[PDB]
Amino acid sequence: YRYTGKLRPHYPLMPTRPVPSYIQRPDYADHPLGMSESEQALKGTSQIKLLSSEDIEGMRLVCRLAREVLDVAAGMIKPGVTTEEIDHAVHLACIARNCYPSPLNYYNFPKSCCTSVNEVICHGIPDRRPLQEGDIVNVDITLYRNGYHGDLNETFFVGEVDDGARKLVQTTYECLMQAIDAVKPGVRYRELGNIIQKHAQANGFSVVRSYCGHGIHKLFHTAPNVPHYAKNKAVGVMKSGHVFTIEPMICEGGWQDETWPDGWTAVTRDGKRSAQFEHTLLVTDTGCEILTRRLDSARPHFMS
Ligand SMILES: CO[C@@H](C(=O)NC1Cc2ccccc2C1)[C@H](O)[C@@H](O)[C@H](O)/C=C/C(C)(C)C
Ligand SMILES: [Mn+2]
Ligand SMILES: [Mn+2]
Ligand code: NA
């Protein structure tokens, strides 16, 4: 393997962390290949669930608890902290909230959250690497509570970062928010990609094509697919009651990705930095409710 930049995996990984049996588990948690039979039964389809009132309540709660756990991780971002140590704290924080860490064993993913540094686009595996001053790191949290998943991420600065890092991070956040601002009933899912690319391109950045936002509720990934690039052919039209994520990955160089030999970590083929933000949204009559918003602070962590 020829690495595309300066990052390398830092092994060994800690043995798989157990989740106490009193915590309710999703179907794939005990499948040997981490396959989800409830998602596989729906691979056929592009039909979107209209959430019941009970489902909405279940989504509001798991997304609020997922925000709480992202904020714990945000608190830990400084030089010299390993991404495994951030994962360990996330794992205890989910169990404290009587939730299962949705990524753990999902398709045999080995950890409880994803930590993506610098040229990593997404799905980085927490490992022994201490964070370095100047890094940008994304922490991607998903919890499962009472049958529902809630998904969100932010990119953070490690100590002082360069001007390029600040611009990439700010533009990525603005891409996400301008796409959120367009959500309301009757808009096509395929439109959000136009909005995101337009703003990335205006700032000289590119949009990852290989990874998309997704419906989420009783399944971790389900309809609709929500691409983040322009002129995509996503199927579907937003209606009140729909829940899904928007999770744009934007890059300093070109948009092309590849995957490390570990089968998970996705990296820019050119080795340049990529940043991401994600929220889980519910469509309402007046636009949408950001289920994974902060309730007690106006801005994402990188602004503070
Ligand atoms: C960018 O990543 C998103 C992602 O793969 N979307 C795709 C849309 C979709 C639709 C159907 C099946 C898989 C997928 C993945 C993903 O949802 C993340 O937000 C999530 O936090 C990480 C999940 C693991 C690492 C546990 C997979
Ligand atoms: Mn996520
Ligand atoms: Mn997601
Ligand atoms: Na990155």
From Swiss-Prot:
<keyword id="KW-0862">Zinc</keyword>
<keyword id="KW-0963">Cytoplasm</keyword>
<dbReference type="GO" id="GO:0070527">
    <property type="term" value="P:platelet aggregation"/>
</dbReference>
<protein>
    <recommendedName>
        <fullName>Methionine aminopeptidase 1</fullName>
        <ecNumber>3.4.11.18</ecNumber>
    </recommendedName>
</protein>
<feature type="binding site">
    <location>
        <position position="123"/>
    </location>
    <ligand>
        <name>a protein</name>
    </ligand>
</feature>
<dbReference type="GO" id="GO:0008235">
    <property type="term" value="F:metalloexopeptidase activity"/>
</dbReference>
<comment type="function">
    <text>Cotranslationally removes the N-terminal methionine from nascent proteins. The N-terminal methionine is often cleaved when the second residue in the primary sequence is small and uncharged (Met-Ala-, Cys, Gly, Pro, Ser, Thr, or Val). Required for normal progression through the cell cycle.</text>
</comment>
<feature type="binding site">
    <location>
        <position position="278"/>
    </location>
    <ligand>
        <name>Zn(2+) 3</name>
    </ligand>
</feature>
<feature type="binding site">
    <location>
        <position position="214"/>
    </location>
    <ligand>
        <name>Zn(2+) 4</name>
    </ligand>
</feature>
<dbReference type="GO" id="GO:0005737">
    <property type="term" value="C:cytoplasm"/>
</dbReference>
<dbReference type="GO" id="GO:0022626">
    <property type="term" value="C:cytosolic ribosome"/>
</dbReference>
<feature type="binding site">
    <location>
        <position position="221"/>
    </location>
    <ligand>
        <name>a protein</name>
    </ligand>
</feature>
<feature type="binding site">
    <location>
        <position position="247"/>
    </location>
    <ligand>
        <name>Zn(2+) 4</name>
    </ligand>
</feature>
<dbReference type="GO" id="GO:0070006">
    <property type="term" value="F:metalloaminopeptidase activity"/>
</dbReference>
<keyword id="KW-0479">Metal-binding</keyword>
<feature type="binding site">
    <location>
        <position position="151"/>
    </location>
    <ligand>
        <name>Zn(2+) 3</name>
    </ligand>
</feature>
<feature type="binding site">
    <location>
        <position position="140"/>
    </location>
    <ligand>
        <name>Zn(2+) 3</name>
    </ligand>
</feature>
<keyword id="KW-0863">Zinc-finger</keyword>
<keyword id="KW-0031">Aminopeptidase</keyword>
<dbReference type="GO" id="GO:0008270">
    <property type="term" value="F:zinc ion binding"/>
</dbReference>
<keyword id="KW-0378">Hydrolase</keyword>
<dbReference type="GO" id="GO:0051604">
    <property type="term" value="P:protein maturation"/>
</dbReference>
<keyword id="KW-0645">Protease</keyword>
<dbReference type="GO" id="GO:0006508">
    <property type="term" value="P:proteolysis"/>
</dbReference>
<feature type="binding site">
    <location>
        <position position="151"/>
    </location>
    <ligand>
        <name>Zn(2+) 4</name>
    </ligand>
</feature>
<dbReference type="GO" id="GO:0004239">
    <property type="term" value="F:initiator methionyl aminopeptidase activity"/>
</dbReference>
<keyword id="KW-0007">Acetylation</keyword>
<dbReference type="GO" id="GO:0006417">
    <property type="term" value="P:regulation of translation"/>
</dbReference>
<comment type="subunit">
    <text>Associates with the 60S ribosomal subunit of the 80S translational complex.</text>
</comment>
<feature type="binding site">
    <location>
        <position position="278"/>
    </location>
    <ligand>
        <name>Zn(2+) 4</name>
    </ligand>
</feature>
<dbReference type="GO" id="GO:0005829">
    <property type="term" value="C:cytosol"/>
</dbReference>
<dbReference type="GO" id="GO:0004177">
    <property type="term" value="F:aminopeptidase activity"/>
</dbReference>
<comment type="similarity">
    <text>Belongs to the peptidase M24A family. Methionine aminopeptidase type 1 subfamily.</text>
</comment>
